[PDB]
Amino acid sequence: MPSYKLTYFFFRGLGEPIRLLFHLAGVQFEEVRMNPDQTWLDIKDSTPMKQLPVLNIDGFELPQSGAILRYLARKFGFAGKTPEEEAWVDAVHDLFKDFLAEFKKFAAERRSGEVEKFRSEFFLPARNTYFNILNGLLEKSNSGFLIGSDITFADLVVVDNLLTLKNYGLFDESEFTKLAALREKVNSYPGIKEYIAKRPV
Amino acid sequence: MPSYKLTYFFFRGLGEPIRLLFHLAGVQFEEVRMNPDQTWLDIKDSTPMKQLPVLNIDGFELPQSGAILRYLARKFGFAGKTPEEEAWVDAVHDLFKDFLAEFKKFAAERRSGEVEKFRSEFFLPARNTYFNILNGLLEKSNSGFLIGSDITFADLVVVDNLLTLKNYGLFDESEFTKLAALREKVNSYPGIKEYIAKRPV
C-alpha cells in the first residue's frame, strides 16, 4: 500500500501533466500545495533540487517534473510500449521542453514595452516548426496519440501546453485540425475527463 | 548486423556525452559529423525533429540528445541501477539542461554589444545554485559519482559542461575542489580516457 505525495504550486505549469498522469492511471495521490506568493527561502532551499514539483512515495523523494513524469509513467505503464517507443516519448517530451522555453521567452517579453510583432517572429517561426514536427507524428500515427498504440505522458505534456498556448491566444484550434483532435482525444480520455471536470479552471 | 550511427556537428556541443557513452560502454558506432556552417536547408528539414544529433541503429532514428542518451544508457547499462536511482539520473540530467539554458543565456550576452557584469550577477546565482545541488549529491556520494554506486550518463553530461564552462573561464578546478574531483573520475574512466586522448583538443 504505497502512498503518493506531490508537492507543487497552485497553477498547472510543469506539475499539471504529472497530475493528469496520476488520474490517467487512476492512482490516488496527496497534493501539498505551495504558495509562490508566500514561499519562504529556507523552505525552497530544502527541496530536493531547490525547486518544485517534488514527488514523495513512501519516503523516496524525486524532484524534476521530467524525471517524475517518467518515473510514474513508467510504473503506471504510460512511458512507452517498447524500449524504442519510450525513447520517442522522451523525444517528443524534450521537443516540448525546448519549445516551452521559446514560448516562455515570448510570453515573458510581450509585456516589456508599440508594435512588437517583430519578436512575434522568433516565436511564430519556432512554434510553427514545433507544430510541424508534432503534425508529423500526428500525420503518421494510427492511434490518435503522438506515439504508441495508446496514450503516453507525451500527449499530456503537449496538450496541457496547447491549453496555455490557447489562453495566450497563440493556438487557434481552427487552423490546426490535427492537434485539435489530439487535445480532444486526451481530454475526453477516461480518468482525465473526470479530473479535468472538477479541475479549478 | 545493425549499425550504430550518430549524426552531429564537428564540435562537442550536445552530442559529446553520447560519444563519451559509446566509448565508456565499448559498443562500436560510426560518426557522421555535420557541417554547422554548411547544412543545406532541406537536409535539416528531413531530420526526425529537424535537429541534430540523431541516433541511427539501422534506419531507426532517435532525435534527442537526452532521449538518445537515456535510450543507449539503458541498453548499455549506465542509466542508473534501481528505478529510483535512474529517476535521479534523469533528474540530475534535467537540472543540467535547466542550467545549460542559463549558460547559453550568458555566453550570448557575454559578447553582444559595456561591462554588463549585472547579467553576470544573474548568471552566478544560477551557476552556484546549480553547483550546490550538484555538490549535495557529490557529498551524499560514496562512489565519487553524482548518483549510484558507479558512473552514469548523468556524469558524462555534467563533466563535459564543466569542461566547456572552463574554456569560458566560468569555472576553476581549485575553487571547486569537489566538482573538479568528479571531472577527473570521468575523463580517466577506462574507455573514456582512451577516446578523449584521441579527440581534437
Q: What SS3 string covers chain A? A: CCCEEEEEECCCCCCHHHHHHHHHCCCCEEEEEECCCCCCHHHHCCCCCCCCCEEEECCEEEECHHHHHHHHHHHCCCCCCCHHHHHHHHHHHHHHHHHHHHHHHHHCCCCCCCCCCCCHHHHHHHHHHHHHHHHHHHHHCCCCCCCCCCCCHHHHHHHHHHHHHHHCCCCCCCCCHHHHHHHHHHHCCCCHHHHHHHCCC
CB contact under 8 A, A67 and B60: no
For residue B64, give the nearest of B37, B91, B97 by alpha carbon. Answer: B97
Residue to substitute from A56, A94, A127, A153, interface B, most B β-carbons within 10 A: A94
- Please list, in sequence order, all residues whose beta carbon lies within 8 angstroms of the beta carbon of residue B54, skipping any fewer than 6 positions away: B5, B6, B7, B8, B47, B48, B61, B62, B63, B68
Give the Å distances, CA to CA, from B50 to A1, A130, B43, B47: 45, 9, 9, 5
> Dihedral, CA atoms, B166, B172, B173, B179, nearest 10 degrees?
-80
CB contact under 8 A, B67 and A94: yes
C-alpha cell at A110: 510581450
Maximum separation of any 2 CA atoms in chain B, in Å: 57
- Beta carbons of A192 and A20 less than 8 angstroms apart: yes
- Beta carbons of B92 and B17 less than 8 angstroms apart: no
C-alpha cell at B108: 550570448
Resolution in A: 3.0
C-alpha cell at A116: 512588437
C-alpha cell at B133: 545541488
C-alpha cell at B72: 543507449
CB contact under 8 A, B101 and A101: yes
- Beta carbons of B55 and B18 less than 8 angstroms apart: yes
Cα distance between residue A77 and residue B120, in whole Å: 44
CB contact under 8 A, B71 and A65: no
Question: Considering only CB atoms, which chain A residues are within 8 Å of B91?
Answer: 48-49, 62-64, 66-68
Cα distance between residue A148 and residue B24, in whole Å: 31
Question: Considering only CB atoms, which chain A residues are within 8 Å of B70?
Answer: 87, 90
| Amino acid (1-letter code) at residue A77 | G
Q: Tell me the CATH number of domain A2-76+189-201, given options 3.40.50.620, 3.30.420.40, 3.40.30.10, 3.40.50.2000.
A: 3.40.30.10
| Phi, psi of B56, deg, nearest 5 | -130, 125
Coil vs helix vs strand at B140:
helix
For residue A198, the distance in angstroms to the closest alpha carbon of chain B comes to 31
CB–CB contacts below 8 A, A to B = 78
For residue B198, the distance in angstroms to the closest alpha carbon of chain A comes to 30
For residue B175, the distance in angstroms to the closest alpha carbon of chain A comes to 22
- Residues making up chain B, counted from first to last: 201
| Amino acid (1-letter code) at residue B201 | V
For residue B88, the distance in angstroms to the closest alpha carbon of chain A comes to 7
Cα distance between residue B178 and residue B137, in whole Å: 11
For residue A49, give the nearest of A67, A29, A69, A73 by alpha carbon. Answer: A67
Q: How many CA atoms within 13 Å lie on the side-chain side of A65?
A: 25
For residue B137, the distance in angstroms to the closest alpha carbon of chain A comes to 10
| Amino acid (1-letter code) at residue B43 | I
Cα distance between residue B82 and residue B32, in whole Å: 34
C-alpha cell at B149: 554506486
For residue A127, the distance in angstroms to the closest alpha carbon of chain B comes to 13
Cα distance between residue B9 and residue A190, in whole Å: 44
| Amino acid (1-letter code) at residue B197 | A
> Which uninterrupted H or E stretch holds B55?
strand B54-57
- Beta carbons of A89 and A154 less than 8 angstroms apart: yes
- Beta carbons of B101 and B123 less than 8 angstroms apart: no
- Beta carbons of B127 and B168 less than 8 angstroms apart: no
**Structural domain boundaries of chain B?**
2-76+189-201, 77-188
Question: Considering only CB atoms, which chain B residues are within 8 Å of A75?
Answer: 83
Residue to substitute from B64, B85, B128, B157, interface A, most A β-carbons within 10 A: B64
Q: What is the C-alpha radius of gyration for chain A, rounded to an integer number of angstroms? A: 17
CB contact under 8 A, B91 and A67: yes
For residue A79, the distance in angstroms to the closest alpha carbon of chain B comes to 12
Q: What's the sign of the alpha-carbon dihedral B4, B8, B13, B14?
A: negative
Q: Which structural technique was applied?
A: X-ray
C-alpha cell at B1: 548486423
- Beta carbons of B142 and B149 less than 8 angstroms apart: yes
Question: Considering only CB atoms, which chain A residues are within 8 Å of B95?
Answer: 49, 64
Give the Å distances, CA to CA, from B1 to A158, B4, B57: 36, 10, 10
Q: Is A159 left (phi over 0), alpha (psi -120 to 50) or beta?
A: alpha
DSSP state of B1: -
- Beta carbons of B138 and B130 less than 8 angstroms apart: no
Question: Considering only CB atoms, which chain A residues are within 8 Å of B64?
Answer: 87, 90-91, 94-95
- Please list, in sequence order, all residues whose beta carbon lies within 8 angstroms of the beta carbon of residue A28, skipping any fewer than 6 positions away: A4, A22
DSSP state of B115: -
- Beta carbons of B123 and B106 less than 8 angstroms apart: yes
CB contact under 8 A, A83 and B75: yes
CB contact under 8 A, A50 and B84: no
Cα distance between residue A102 and residue A109, in whole Å: 11
Buried b (16+ CB within 10 A) or exposed e, B66-93: bbbbbbbbbebebbbeeeeebbbbbbbb
The alpha-helical segments, DSSP class H, found in B47-152 are 65-76, 83-109, 117-140
Helix crossing, B83-109 with B65-76: angle to 10°?
150
Which among A50, A62, A133 has CB closest to B133?
A50
Cα distance between residue B70 and residue A9, in whole Å: 28
Residue to substitute from A44, A88, A130, interface B, most B β-carbons within 10 A: A88
DSSP state of B109: H
- Beta carbons of A18 and A65 less than 8 angstroms apart: yes
| Strands of the A4-9 sheet, one edge to the other | A29-34, A4-9, A54-57, A60-63
Cα distance between residue A163 and residue A17, in whole Å: 12
- Beta carbons of B94 and B153 less than 8 angstroms apart: no
Q: Tell me the CATH number of domain A77-188, given options 1.20.1050.10, 3.20.20.70, 3.40.50.300, 3.40.50.2300.
A: 1.20.1050.10
- Beta carbons of A114 and A130 less than 8 angstroms apart: no
- Beta carbons of A60 and B88 less than 8 angstroms apart: no
CB contact under 8 A, A62 and B91: yes
For residue A67, give the nearest of A83, A82, A51, A43 by alpha carbon. Answer: A51
Maximum separation of any 2 CA atoms in chain A, in Å: 58
Breaks in chain A (C to N over 2.5 Å), named by the residue before each, are: 113
What's the burial of A2, exposed, middle or buried (CB within 10 Å: 0-12/13-18/19+)?
exposed
CB contact under 8 A, A50 and B97: no
